[PDB]
Design a binder for this molecule. Structure first.
Ligand SMILES: CC(C)(CC(=O)O)CC(=O)Nc1cc(Cl)cc(Cl)c1
Length: 130
């Protein structure tokens, strides 16, 4: 839809602080911090797929809006995720060990903007079309 495409990370703010708040250790934060992944979003019927590709780590999720699914995250959390579409924003919540984090993906001019919140930390990542 508005989201379908191949997207390249161009800017990131507060990602280390976000990863620290999730409990990610030094080595994994170090491998994630300077990475510039591609995000590839596609849709087939009811099923949306989001691939994240980077030199040292790839991940993929496929889901139906409003249907909880199990996910292994790039930092190896085993989470339960639910993704909904609210006002044109794709809103993902991940739940694990009594904690939650929310990841919101929105389209703003030429940008795919991703806002990641864990407790008091808010990280913003900006992608542009490859
Ligand atoms: C939602 C998220 C936290 C942020 C975003 O979508 O931008 C997911 C993300 O970036 N995962 C990720 C990061 C690296 Cl560095 C490499 C690989 Cl494979 C995956």
């Amino acid at each position: 839809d508005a989201f379908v495409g191949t997207w390249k990370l161009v800017s990131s703010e507060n990602f280390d602080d976000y990863m620290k708040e999730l409990g990610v250790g030094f080595a994994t934060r170090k491998m994630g911090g300077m990475a510039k992944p591609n995000c590839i979003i596609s849709v087939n019927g009811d099923v949306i797929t989001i691939k994240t590709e980077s030199t040292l780590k790839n991940t993929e999720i496929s889901f139906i809006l409003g249907q909880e699914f199990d996910e292994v995250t790039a930092d190896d959390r085993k989470v339960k995720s639910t993704i909904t579409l609210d006002g044109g924003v794709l809103v993902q919540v991940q739940k694990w060990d009594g904690k939650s984090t929310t990841i919101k993906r929105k389209r703003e001019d030429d940008k795919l903007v991703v806002e990641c919140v864990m407790k008091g930390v808010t990280c913003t990542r900006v992608y542009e079309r490859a």
